[PDB]
Amino acid sequence: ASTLTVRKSLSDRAKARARRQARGRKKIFGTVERPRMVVTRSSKHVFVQVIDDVAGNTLVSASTMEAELREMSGDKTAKAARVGTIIGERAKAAGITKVVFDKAGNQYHGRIAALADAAREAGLDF
Amino acid sequence: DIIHLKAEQRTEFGKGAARRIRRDDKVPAVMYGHDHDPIHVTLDGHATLLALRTENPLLSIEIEGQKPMLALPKDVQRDVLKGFVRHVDLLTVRRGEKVDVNVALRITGESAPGTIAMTEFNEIEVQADLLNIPEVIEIDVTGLEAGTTIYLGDLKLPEGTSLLGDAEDVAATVAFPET
Amino acid sequence: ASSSRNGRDSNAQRLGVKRFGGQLVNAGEIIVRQRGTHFHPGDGVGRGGDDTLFALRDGNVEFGTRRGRRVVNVTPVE
Amino acid sequence: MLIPRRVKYRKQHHPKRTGAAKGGTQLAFGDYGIQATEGGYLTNRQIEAARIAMTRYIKRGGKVWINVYPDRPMTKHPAESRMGSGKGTPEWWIANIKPGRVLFELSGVPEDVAREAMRLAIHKLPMKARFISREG
RNA sequence: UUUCCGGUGGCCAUAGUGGAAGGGAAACACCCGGUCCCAUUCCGAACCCGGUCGUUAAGCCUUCCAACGCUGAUGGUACUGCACGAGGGAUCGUGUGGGAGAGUAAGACGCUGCCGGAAU
RNA sequence: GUCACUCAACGGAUAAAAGGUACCCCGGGAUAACAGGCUGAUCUUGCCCGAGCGCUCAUAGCGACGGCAUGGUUUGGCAC
RNA sequence: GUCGCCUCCUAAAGGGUAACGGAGGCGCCCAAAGGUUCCCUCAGCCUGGUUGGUAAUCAGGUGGUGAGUGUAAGUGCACAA
RNA sequence: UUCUCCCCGAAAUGCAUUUAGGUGCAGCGUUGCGUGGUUCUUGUUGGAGGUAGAGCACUGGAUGGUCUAGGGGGCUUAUCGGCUUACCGAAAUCAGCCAAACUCCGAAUGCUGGCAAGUGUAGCGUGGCAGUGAGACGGCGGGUGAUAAGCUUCGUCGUCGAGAGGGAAACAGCCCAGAUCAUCAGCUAAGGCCCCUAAGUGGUGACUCAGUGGGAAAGGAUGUGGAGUUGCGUAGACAACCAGGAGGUUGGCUUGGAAGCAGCCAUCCUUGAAAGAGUGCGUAAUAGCUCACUGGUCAAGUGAUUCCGCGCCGAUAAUGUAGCG
Ligand SMILES: [Mg+2]
Ligand SMILES: [Mg+2]
Ligand SMILES: [Mg+2]
Ligand SMILES: [Mg+2]
Ligand SMILES: [Mg+2]
Ligand SMILES: [Mg+2]
Ligand SMILES: [Mg+2]
Ligand SMILES: [Mg+2]
Ligand SMILES: [Mg+2]
Ligand SMILES: [Mg+2]
Ligand SMILES: [Mg+2]
Ligand SMILES: [Mg+2]
Ligand SMILES: [Mg+2]
Ligand SMILES: [Mg+2]
Ligand SMILES: [Mg+2]
Ligand SMILES: [Mg+2]
Ligand SMILES: [Mg+2]
Ligand SMILES: [Mg+2]
Ligand SMILES: [Mg+2]
Ligand SMILES: [Mg+2]
Ligand SMILES: [Mg+2]
Ligand SMILES: [Mg+2]
Ligand SMILES: [Mg+2]
Ligand SMILES: [Mg+2]
Ligand SMILES: [Mg+2]
Ligand SMILES: [Mg+2]
Ligand SMILES: [Mg+2]
Ligand SMILES: [Mg+2]
Ligand SMILES: [Mg+2]
Ligand SMILES: [Mg+2]
Ligand SMILES: [Mg+2]
Ligand SMILES: [Mg+2]
Ligand SMILES: [Mg+2]
Ligand SMILES: [Mg+2]
Ligand SMILES: [Mg+2]
Ligand SMILES: [Mg+2]
Ligand SMILES: [Mg+2]
Ligand SMILES: [Mg+2]
Ligand SMILES: [Mg+2]
Ligand SMILES: [Mg+2]
Ligand SMILES: [Mg+2]
Ligand SMILES: [Mg+2]
Ligand SMILES: [Mg+2]
């Protein structure tokens, strides 16, 4: 469900995030060679999916929602780094190697940056 | 009242076919409704003109193979200089039912010689019943002068003829002469 | 007598689509000369300094819509 | 004399005078009216003459509508001059009349004297025109 | 497998706008802080960080409303390629092909892919 | 590699250039003056409408505003 | 009066198309008004507010392009160019 | 600028020019060599568009209505405040409109690809030799000009140029048709068939009576045929012909006179089977003559009104009929 225009009556923070996400997506686009890693950073969780934007499907994905990580005691940044390591491992399993990072309207910092560096250490070329 | 018109199937379409029909002194018509596919027919020119002399008449179209069916002329394309009917849109009506139509406004009132009544509209969209179509809607401005104006929400409309158009705009105006 | 304050005009620039839909093109072949992006660069199409849309790869030219934009794509040849 | 307050371009191509009336073929304000049966150009002087005739005949009662407006400027080549040296200066203002166009309308007047006033007006126009009504 | 919901695309209003009613299990969100990375051309509003108590009031979600907007035939008309014809002239008509725009009936309170969630 | 031209008459005759000819001299009707021809804006001669003026009385006689043409003799347009 | 260049119309929905046809511009400017990266959304309107007025700055509401674009015009650009 | 025949066969455009009647390059001709369906036509299939038309979303132009900020005029009288706002009025809004340089829209054609079929021998490359670079008119779409020109300048097709033959009275540019030669054969095209003049004073049905045909406008007209719509009509219509065609009332501002007739109006009432403060003619001013309306002998159709076909007037220069040859 995408509609170009930012939905009116949306909250101010949601509109700001949607606009920033759109302007990043303006140049970010995932192909089979370099799929697009999208990280949605909700207030309590981060959900990462590697998407082939040509076909419109997700190849691999991960999130803090996984039961193996729900009870993994740690700070938000540490949990995001664990998610990044997991998603890098799954990308290696699927044979992705190189991706393009889509911050999805958020600043590349904090939890998002920790997850990105964790994936880089796991072995993703980006 | 019901006006009966004999019609037969029309199958040739286009400007050439329409010209040939009008030279044959018939008139093309398309009859459509809310239940069936549009039917393309041709009518007798003289009979169509006689029927369409009045405004919003209830017509019954008879086709030899088919059965008579009830319609109203919703859009009549007439010639501009000559008065001939060039094309008819017939909208089918389900006998016992309700319809939206236009009824003509006229002035039948007299005021002081200084002021003259004026109509702000030719027709008003009035939701009436089939068997009682108001031929004319009449408003009387007698004994009223100066700059009084009449909107669409105060009319002596006949029974069963509800107003569908907007009631927040003027319909009749009386004002001093063309000074 | 009189005179005209007009009579100046610029040389013909010869804009417009140079390769229409389905036409086979080579890489780098110019597809449309234009001022501004009446057509945006689509897949396999690059946009130059003067908004010329050219082919980034061999294939067939198609005109389409990408999101809300009129775009020109070059489908790679089968 | 109807002259527009301003126009975007004072020197324009001659208006197309082909085809029937694009719009305004039906009475919209008055009860009776003049309908042009032939196309042509209608200058502001002719419009004013016809309006004066109608108003003067109908005296004080009734009201007149001028449906058309002479907003198209017509230039004139400078007199006694050879061809060339640019377009001329606007000299006439016209309205583009096509067959079926309603030019003038009248209301608040009995039909017979309305007809006579329309006849007076029509005898001032440069194209054929007829008296029309809302079928009475 | 299904239902519901959160993300991420595609079509880009038949999806919007406005009104009404109802919903939160996970989730989303507002919310609570600012000690820490970081931040405000002032402001922890925002960005960022730390929590998930509180709250479905709003976002979001579900149902309903053609009301504004949007979509929209058939037939006819305008125009028109070709071939002719008629007027003193503006210009007009016909044959043979194509054929709108406006308007009319009507449609429509979105459609569809992938991933995840909680239950089945 | 770069510089020096309002070479602007901007594909840029010379680095360097204004006038007079009724004293004039040596292809074009491709092009003007005269006449003819076309056209008819202008001119001209009529005509339609009838506001008004004519004690009264539109039309004895006049004719405002507008409209339609004739003639080709006026000034022009065209350059056959 | 004009002569080179640019934009629009004429130009008859590719391109091209003449007249002493109709409109305007150019002979620059900018060390940022270039490159890149991230962020932002205007004009107008309504309401409230010291000086303060139609209009300075501020607040809330509305408002999708009608603002803006170094410079003409067109094509673009609110995903912002 | 001098002999012949055979084959093909232009251009009068673009660009540049101390250039505009010159010239270079390209376009178009021919020819050698090479390449062979690449050209072209039609169908089919797919593209980009913003013209015609249309529309009013935008930008301008615009009519009327509603409504109104705000300006003008007054007074009570003003510092207000009120009555006014019977005046003006941006904006907004409703309805009808306008646009080469407006567009929410949007053709037909044209252009350009794929495919298929058809096709003269078309297309292309590369050499030799050119000529041309003053065009004309007609159809269609436009600019300049005045709705002008056998005008001027473009787009496009045709002919002429460089094209004889047939038609157009004659008549480069219009229509038919592209002449290899011969023929004292036939069929046709455009156009024609009374005679000039080849073929019908053809057949059948309508219309015209103007010599319209065989030039023209606004406008005007009981011309004439046909097709409607509609009022009245043997309760007896329209004409024609005998009686009532008038009281109150010389209705009022006029004007020595407006009594029914100078101009402008409420556009009434009555003795009654019948009538208008009143329509023509008359008239200093009233008189009166005479009509719609009422009886009757007669009485079968009249009175409007619209559209269509063909005609009429408007119509009008100078050597001689003289605008069918
Ligand atoms: Mg650039
Ligand atoms: Mg550049
Ligand atoms: Mg309209
Ligand atoms: Mg529609
Ligand atoms: Mg349509
Ligand atoms: Mg030069
Ligand atoms: Mg030199
Ligand atoms: Mg001397
Ligand atoms: Mg000499
Ligand atoms: Mg000459
Ligand atoms: Mg010559
Ligand atoms: Mg001469
Ligand atoms: Mg001579
Ligand atoms: Mg002369
Ligand atoms: Mg000349
Ligand atoms: Mg010439
Ligand atoms: Mg073009
Ligand atoms: Mg074209
Ligand atoms: Mg040229
Ligand atoms: Mg030959
Ligand atoms: Mg147009
Ligand atoms: Mg040459
Ligand atoms: Mg030359
Ligand atoms: Mg030349
Ligand atoms: Mg020439
Ligand atoms: Mg030429
Ligand atoms: Mg020509
Ligand atoms: Mg012209
Ligand atoms: Mg010529
Ligand atoms: Mg020659
Ligand atoms: Mg020839
Ligand atoms: Mg010949
Ligand atoms: Mg001949
Ligand atoms: Mg001959
Ligand atoms: Mg024969
Ligand atoms: Mg023949
Ligand atoms: Mg002879
Ligand atoms: Mg005979
Ligand atoms: Mg005979
Ligand atoms: Mg005669
Ligand atoms: Mg004659
Ligand atoms: Mg005549
Ligand atoms: Mg003859």
Short mmCIF file of N, CA, C and O (backbone and C1' of nucleotides) in Angstrom, two decimals, chain F residues 9-13 27-28 30-31 38-41 46-48 56-57 67-71 76-79, chain H residues 15-18 21 134 146 148-152 215-220 262-263 283 314-318:
data_model
loop_
_atom_site.label_atom_id
_atom_site.label_comp_id
_atom_site.label_asym_id
_atom_site.label_seq_id
_atom_site.Cartn_x
_atom_site.Cartn_y
_atom_site.Cartn_z
P A F 9 26.49 46.34 -37.23
"O5'" A F 9 26.24 45.49 -38.56
"C5'" A F 9 25.46 44.30 -38.55
"C4'" A F 9 25.57 43.58 -39.87
"C3'" A F 9 26.87 42.80 -40.07
"O3'" A F 9 26.63 41.74 -40.99
"C1'" A F 9 26.77 44.56 -41.64
P C F 10 26.09 40.32 -40.48
"O5'" C F 10 26.91 40.05 -39.15
"C5'" C F 10 28.20 39.46 -39.20
"C4'" C F 10 28.52 38.77 -37.90
"C3'" C F 10 27.56 37.68 -37.49
"O3'" C F 10 27.92 36.43 -38.05
"C1'" C F 10 27.99 39.13 -35.65
P G F 11 27.20 35.85 -39.36
"O5'" G F 11 28.34 35.00 -40.06
"C5'" G F 11 29.64 35.53 -40.23
"C4'" G F 11 30.38 34.82 -41.34
"C3'" G F 11 29.72 34.86 -42.72
"O3'" G F 11 30.06 36.01 -43.49
"C1'" G F 11 30.30 32.64 -42.18
P G F 12 29.67 37.50 -43.02
"O5'" G F 12 30.70 37.80 -41.86
"C5'" G F 12 30.96 39.11 -41.40
"C4'" G F 12 32.37 39.21 -40.90
"C3'" G F 12 33.44 38.93 -41.94
"O3'" G F 12 33.69 40.03 -42.78
"C1'" G F 12 33.94 37.73 -39.98
P A F 13 33.92 39.61 -44.31
"O5'" A F 13 35.31 40.32 -44.63
"C5'" A F 13 35.31 41.58 -45.34
"C4'" A F 13 35.79 41.32 -46.74
"C3'" A F 13 37.16 41.91 -47.11
"O3'" A F 13 38.13 40.88 -47.09
"C1'" A F 13 35.54 42.08 -48.89
P G F 27 23.36 46.35 -73.29
"O5'" G F 27 22.51 45.47 -72.28
"C5'" G F 27 21.28 45.93 -71.77
"C4'" G F 27 21.06 45.45 -70.36
"C3'" G F 27 19.62 45.43 -69.89
"O3'" G F 27 18.93 44.27 -70.30
"C1'" G F 27 20.93 46.53 -68.29
P G F 28 17.47 44.39 -70.95
"O5'" G F 28 16.51 44.52 -69.70
"C5'" G F 28 16.60 43.62 -68.60
"C4'" G F 28 15.89 44.16 -67.39
"C3'" G F 28 14.47 44.64 -67.62
"O3'" G F 28 13.52 43.58 -67.64
"C1'" G F 28 15.65 46.24 -66.35
P A F 30 8.47 42.82 -65.93
"O5'" A F 30 9.87 42.52 -65.25
"C5'" A F 30 10.45 43.44 -64.33
"C4'" A F 30 10.80 42.76 -63.03
"C3'" A F 30 11.57 43.61 -62.03
"O3'" A F 30 11.21 43.23 -60.71
"C1'" A F 30 12.85 41.72 -62.61
P U F 31 9.90 43.83 -60.01
"O5'" U F 31 10.43 45.13 -59.26
"C5'" U F 31 9.54 46.00 -58.58
"C4'" U F 31 9.61 47.41 -59.10
"C3'" U F 31 9.09 47.60 -60.52
"O3'" U F 31 8.54 48.91 -60.65
"C1'" U F 31 11.37 48.19 -60.44
P C F 38 -10.35 45.89 -64.92
"O5'" C F 38 -9.93 45.12 -63.59
"C5'" C F 38 -9.65 43.73 -63.62
"C4'" C F 38 -8.95 43.31 -62.36
"C3'" C F 38 -9.58 43.80 -61.07
"O3'" C F 38 -10.68 43.01 -60.65
"C1'" C F 38 -7.26 44.21 -61.00
"C1'" U F 39 -9.14 45.97 -56.30
"C3'" U F 39 -11.30 45.10 -55.89
"C4'" U F 39 -10.45 44.05 -56.57
"O3'" U F 39 -12.19 44.53 -54.95
"C5'" U F 39 -11.09 43.31 -57.71
"O5'" U F 39 -11.63 44.21 -58.67
P U F 39 -12.02 43.70 -60.12
P G F 40 -13.73 44.96 -54.92
"O5'" G F 40 -13.71 46.36 -54.17
"C5'" G F 40 -13.01 46.51 -52.94
"C4'" G F 40 -12.80 47.96 -52.60
"C3'" G F 40 -14.09 48.75 -52.36
"O3'" G F 40 -13.89 49.69 -51.31
"C1'" G F 40 -12.88 49.70 -54.17
P A F 41 -14.86 49.68 -50.03
"O5'" A F 41 -14.05 50.46 -48.91
"C5'" A F 41 -13.52 49.79 -47.77
"C4'" A F 41 -12.29 50.48 -47.28
"C3'" A F 41 -12.35 52.00 -47.30
"O3'" A F 41 -12.95 52.54 -46.14
"C1'" A F 41 -10.35 51.27 -48.34
P G F 46 -28.06 60.55 -55.76
"O5'" G F 46 -28.85 59.18 -55.95
"C5'" G F 46 -29.42 58.51 -54.84
"C4'" G F 46 -29.51 57.03 -55.08
"C3'" G F 46 -30.34 56.25 -54.08
"O3'" G F 46 -31.72 56.32 -54.35
"C1'" G F 46 -28.29 55.14 -54.41
P C F 47 -32.76 56.61 -53.16
"O5'" C F 47 -32.85 55.22 -52.40
"C5'" C F 47 -33.14 54.03 -53.11
"C4'" C F 47 -32.73 52.80 -52.35
"C3'" C F 47 -33.28 52.68 -50.94
"O3'" C F 47 -34.62 52.23 -50.91
"C1'" C F 47 -30.98 52.15 -50.94
P C F 48 -35.59 52.70 -49.72
"O5'" C F 48 -35.25 51.69 -48.55
"C5'" C F 48 -35.34 50.29 -48.75
"C4'" C F 48 -34.88 49.54 -47.54
"C3'" C F 48 -35.38 50.06 -46.20
"O3'" C F 48 -36.70 49.64 -45.91
"C1'" C F 48 -33.06 49.63 -46.06
P U F 56 -46.19 70.41 -33.58
"O5'" U F 56 -47.58 69.76 -34.05
"C5'" U F 56 -48.66 69.67 -33.09
"C4'" U F 56 -49.83 68.96 -33.73
"C3'" U F 56 -49.50 67.63 -34.41
"O3'" U F 56 -49.45 66.60 -33.44
"C1'" U F 56 -50.87 68.95 -35.83
P C F 57 -48.79 65.23 -33.95
"O5'" C F 57 -49.74 64.78 -35.18
"C5'" C F 57 -49.39 63.60 -35.93
"C4'" C F 57 -49.20 63.96 -37.39
"C3'" C F 57 -47.83 63.60 -38.00
"O3'" C F 57 -47.74 62.22 -38.31
"C1'" C F 57 -48.50 65.78 -38.68
P G F 67 -22.73 50.11 -39.53
"O5'" G F 67 -23.72 49.25 -40.44
"C5'" G F 67 -24.31 48.07 -39.92
"C4'" G F 67 -25.49 47.63 -40.75
"C3'" G F 67 -25.21 47.39 -42.22
"O3'" G F 67 -24.58 46.15 -42.48
"C1'" G F 67 -27.16 48.68 -42.02
P C F 68 -23.45 46.05 -43.61
"O5'" C F 68 -24.27 46.00 -44.96
"C5'" C F 68 -25.28 45.03 -45.15
"C4'" C F 68 -25.99 45.25 -46.46
"C3'" C F 68 -25.09 45.38 -47.67
"O3'" C F 68 -24.66 44.14 -48.17
"C1'" C F 68 -26.70 47.11 -47.69
P A F 69 -23.30 44.03 -49.02
"O5'" A F 69 -23.78 44.20 -50.52
"C5'" A F 69 -23.08 45.04 -51.43
"C4'" A F 69 -24.04 45.83 -52.28
"C3'" A F 69 -23.42 46.61 -53.43
"O3'" A F 69 -23.18 45.80 -54.57
"C1'" A F 69 -24.91 48.00 -52.25
P U F 70 -21.99 46.15 -55.58
"O5'" U F 70 -22.54 47.40 -56.40
"C5'" U F 70 -23.71 47.28 -57.19
"C4'" U F 70 -24.04 48.58 -57.87
"C3'" U F 70 -22.94 49.18 -58.72
"O3'" U F 70 -22.88 48.59 -60.01
"C1'" U F 70 -23.88 50.85 -57.35
P G F 71 -21.47 48.32 -60.71
"O5'" G F 71 -20.95 49.76 -61.10
"C5'" G F 71 -21.69 50.60 -61.98
"C4'" G F 71 -21.18 52.01 -61.94
"C3'" G F 71 -19.69 52.17 -62.17
"O3'" G F 71 -19.36 52.20 -63.54
"C1'" G F 71 -20.35 53.44 -60.28
P G F 76 -2.34 60.05 -54.60
"O5'" G F 76 -2.41 58.87 -53.53
"C5'" G F 76 -2.23 57.52 -53.91
"C4'" G F 76 -2.85 56.59 -52.90
"C3'" G F 76 -2.38 55.14 -52.94
"O3'" G F 76 -1.13 54.95 -52.29
"C1'" G F 76 -4.73 55.20 -52.77
P G F 77 -0.08 53.89 -52.87
"O5'" G F 77 -0.79 52.49 -52.64
"C5'" G F 77 -1.03 52.00 -51.33
"C4'" G F 77 -1.78 50.70 -51.37
"C3'" G F 77 -1.16 49.61 -52.23
"O3'" G F 77 -0.12 48.92 -51.59
"C1'" G F 77 -3.45 49.79 -52.72
P C F 78 1.24 48.60 -52.39
"O5'" C F 78 0.78 47.60 -53.54
"C5'" C F 78 0.40 46.27 -53.24
"C4'" C F 78 -0.10 45.55 -54.46
"C3'" C F 78 0.89 45.38 -55.60
"O3'" C F 78 1.79 44.31 -55.39
"C1'" C F 78 -1.22 46.04 -56.45
P A F 79 3.37 44.55 -55.45
"O5'" A F 79 3.77 44.22 -56.96
"C5'" A F 79 2.98 43.37 -57.77
"C4'" A F 79 2.97 43.84 -59.21
"C3'" A F 79 4.34 44.01 -59.84
"O3'" A F 79 4.25 43.78 -61.24
"C1'" A F 79 3.25 46.09 -59.79
P C H 15 16.66 29.01 -45.24
"O5'" C H 15 18.23 28.81 -45.10
"C5'" C H 15 18.76 27.94 -44.12
"C4'" C H 15 20.23 27.67 -44.35
"C3'" C H 15 21.11 28.90 -44.49
"O3'" C H 15 21.43 29.50 -43.26
"C1'" C H 15 21.63 27.37 -46.20
P A H 16 21.46 31.10 -43.14
"O5'" A H 16 22.81 31.50 -43.87
"C5'" A H 16 24.06 31.04 -43.39
"C4'" A H 16 25.16 31.24 -44.39
"C3'" A H 16 25.34 32.63 -44.95
"O3'" A H 16 25.98 33.52 -44.07
"C1'" A H 16 25.48 31.06 -46.70
P U H 17 25.55 35.06 -44.21
"O5'" U H 17 26.22 35.54 -45.58
"C5'" U H 17 27.66 35.65 -45.66
"C4'" U H 17 28.03 35.78 -47.11
"C3'" U H 17 27.68 37.12 -47.76
"O3'" U H 17 28.72 38.06 -47.58
"C1'" U H 17 27.01 35.32 -49.17
P U H 18 28.12 39.41 -46.96
"O5'" U H 18 27.69 40.26 -48.24
"C5'" U H 18 28.51 40.19 -49.42
"C4'" U H 18 28.43 41.50 -50.15
"C3'" U H 18 29.39 41.67 -51.34
"O3'" U H 18 28.70 42.22 -52.45
"C1'" U H 18 29.62 43.48 -49.86
P G H 21 17.31 39.94 -57.21
"O5'" G H 21 18.20 39.33 -58.37
"C5'" G H 21 18.26 37.93 -58.59
"C4'" G H 21 18.67 37.61 -60.01
"C3'" G H 21 20.13 37.90 -60.34
"O3'" G H 21 20.55 37.03 -61.39
"C1'" G H 21 18.74 39.30 -61.64
P A H 134 16.40 32.93 -57.45
"O5'" A H 134 15.52 32.72 -58.75
"C5'" A H 134 15.33 33.77 -59.68
"C4'" A H 134 14.02 34.48 -59.48
"C3'" A H 134 12.77 33.62 -59.66
"O3'" A H 134 11.73 34.12 -58.82
"C1'" A H 134 12.79 35.34 -61.29
P A H 146 -6.18 46.80 -42.86
"O5'" A H 146 -7.57 46.09 -43.16
"C5'" A H 146 -8.67 46.25 -42.28
"C4'" A H 146 -9.98 45.92 -42.95
"C3'" A H 146 -10.08 44.52 -43.54
"O3'" A H 146 -11.43 44.07 -43.46
"C1'" A H 146 -10.34 46.12 -45.25
P A H 148 -10.74 39.84 -47.19
"O5'" A H 148 -10.77 40.50 -48.64
"C5'" A H 148 -11.55 41.66 -48.90
"C4'" A H 148 -11.19 42.31 -50.20
"C3'" A H 148 -10.08 41.67 -51.01
"O3'" A H 148 -10.54 40.57 -51.77
"C1'" A H 148 -9.78 44.02 -50.95
P A H 149 -9.52 39.41 -52.23
"O5'" A H 149 -8.76 40.04 -53.47
"C5'" A H 149 -9.43 40.35 -54.68
"C4'" A H 149 -8.55 41.16 -55.59
"C3'" A H 149 -7.23 40.50 -55.97
"O3'" A H 149 -7.34 39.74 -57.16
"C1'" A H 149 -6.84 42.70 -55.16
P G H 150 -8.05 38.29 -57.18
"O5'" G H 150 -7.76 37.77 -58.66
"C5'" G H 150 -7.02 36.58 -58.88
"C4'" G H 150 -5.70 36.86 -59.55
"C3'" G H 150 -4.91 38.05 -59.01
"O3'" G H 150 -3.52 37.75 -59.02
"C1'" G H 150 -5.26 38.33 -61.32
P C H 151 -2.71 37.66 -57.64
"O5'" C H 151 -3.07 39.01 -56.90
"C5'" C H 151 -2.54 40.24 -57.37
"C4'" C H 151 -1.92 41.03 -56.25
"C3'" C H 151 -0.82 40.33 -55.47
"O3'" C H 151 0.43 40.39 -56.13
"C1'" C H 151 -2.33 41.35 -53.97
P U H 152 1.45 39.15 -56.04
"O5'" U H 152 1.96 39.20 -54.54
"C5'" U H 152 2.65 40.34 -54.05
"C4'" U H 152 2.82 40.27 -52.56
"C3'" U H 152 3.42 38.98 -52.02
"O3'" U H 152 4.83 38.95 -52.14
"C1'" U H 152 1.54 39.57 -50.73
P G H 215 -27.68 36.66 -66.66
"O5'" G H 215 -27.13 35.86 -65.41
"C5'" G H 215 -27.54 36.20 -64.09
"C4'" G H 215 -26.36 36.40 -63.18
"C3'" G H 215 -26.65 37.13 -61.88
"O3'" G H 215 -27.20 36.30 -60.88
"C1'" G H 215 -24.74 38.06 -62.89
P A H 216 -28.29 36.89 -59.86
"O5'" A H 216 -27.45 37.88 -58.95
"C5'" A H 216 -26.40 37.41 -58.12
"C4'" A H 216 -25.95 38.48 -57.17
"C3'" A H 216 -27.06 39.19 -56.42
"O3'" A H 216 -27.47 38.46 -55.28
"C1'" A H 216 -25.59 40.79 -57.33
P A H 217 -28.86 38.79 -54.56
"O5'" A H 217 -28.43 39.66 -53.30
"C5'" A H 217 -27.34 39.26 -52.48
"C4'" A H 217 -27.02 40.30 -51.45
"C3'" A H 217 -28.21 40.80 -50.65
"O3'" A H 217 -28.53 39.95 -49.57
"C1'" A H 217 -26.98 42.64 -51.45
P A H 218 -30.05 39.79 -49.09
"O5'" A H 218 -30.22 40.92 -47.99
"C5'" A H 218 -29.29 41.04 -46.92
"C4'" A H 218 -29.33 42.42 -46.31
"C3'" A H 218 -30.70 42.90 -45.87
"O3'" A H 218 -31.07 42.42 -44.59
"C1'" A H 218 -29.66 44.58 -47.15
P G H 219 -32.37 41.50 -44.43
"O5'" G H 219 -33.56 42.41 -44.95
"C5'" G H 219 -33.87 43.63 -44.31
"C4'" G H 219 -34.48 44.63 -45.27
"C3'" G H 219 -35.89 44.34 -45.73
"O3'" G H 219 -36.88 44.71 -44.79
"C1'" G H 219 -34.57 44.89 -47.59
P G H 220 -38.19 43.79 -44.60
"O5'" G H 220 -39.02 44.05 -45.93
"C5'" G H 220 -39.53 45.34 -46.23
"C4'" G H 220 -40.02 45.44 -47.65
"C3'" G H 220 -41.17 44.53 -48.04
"O3'" G H 220 -42.43 44.99 -47.58
"C1'" G H 220 -39.54 44.51 -49.74
P A H 262 -56.64 66.24 -32.97
"O5'" A H 262 -55.94 66.97 -31.73
"C5'" A H 262 -55.15 66.22 -30.81
"C4'" A H 262 -53.67 66.43 -31.06
"C3'" A H 262 -52.75 65.38 -30.46
"O3'" A H 262 -52.66 64.22 -31.28
"C1'" A H 262 -51.90 67.55 -30.03
P G H 263 -52.08 62.84 -30.69
"O5'" G H 263 -50.52 63.12 -30.49
"C5'" G H 263 -49.65 62.10 -30.03
"C4'" G H 263 -48.68 62.62 -29.01
"C3'" G H 263 -48.68 61.89 -27.67
"O3'" G H 263 -47.92 60.70 -27.69
"C1'" G H 263 -48.78 64.22 -27.29
P U H 283 -61.98 68.63 -44.77
"O5'" U H 283 -61.06 68.87 -43.49
"C5'" U H 283 -61.23 70.02 -42.68
"C4'" U H 283 -61.88 69.69 -41.36
"C3'" U H 283 -61.90 70.79 -40.32
"O3'" U H 283 -62.93 71.74 -40.53
"C1'" U H 283 -61.22 68.76 -39.32
P G H 314 -36.36 46.89 -60.10
"O5'" G H 314 -35.54 47.20 -58.78
"C5'" G H 314 -35.97 48.19 -57.86
"C4'" G H 314 -35.24 48.07 -56.55
"C3'" G H 314 -33.72 48.06 -56.66
"O3'" G H 314 -33.19 49.37 -56.73
"C1'" G H 314 -34.43 46.29 -55.26
P A H 315 -31.85 49.68 -57.55
"O5'" A H 315 -32.15 49.12 -59.01
"C5'" A H 315 -31.43 49.61 -60.13
"C4'" A H 315 -31.19 48.54 -61.17
"C3'" A H 315 -32.43 47.88 -61.75
"O3'" A H 315 -32.16 47.49 -63.09
"C1'" A H 315 -31.13 46.25 -60.67
P U H 316 -32.45 48.49 -64.31
"O5'" U H 316 -31.29 49.58 -64.23
"C5'" U H 316 -29.95 49.26 -64.54
"C4'" U H 316 -29.03 50.40 -64.19
"C3'" U H 316 -27.54 50.10 -64.23
"O3'" U H 316 -27.01 50.19 -65.54
"C1'" U H 316 -28.08 51.28 -62.24
P A H 317 -25.66 49.41 -65.94
"O5'" A H 317 -25.00 50.34 -67.04
"C5'" A H 317 -24.72 51.71 -66.76
"C4'" A H 317 -24.36 52.48 -68.00
"C3'" A H 317 -23.05 52.06 -68.66
"O3'" A H 317 -23.15 52.27 -70.07
"C1'" A H 317 -22.90 54.31 -68.01
P A H 318 -22.54 51.20 -71.09
"O5'" A H 318 -22.35 52.03 -72.43
"C5'" A H 318 -21.08 52.55 -72.79
"C4'" A H 318 -21.12 54.04 -72.97
"C3'" A H 318 -19.84 54.68 -73.47
"O3'" A H 318 -19.71 54.59 -74.88
"C1'" A H 318 -20.69 55.92 -71.65
#
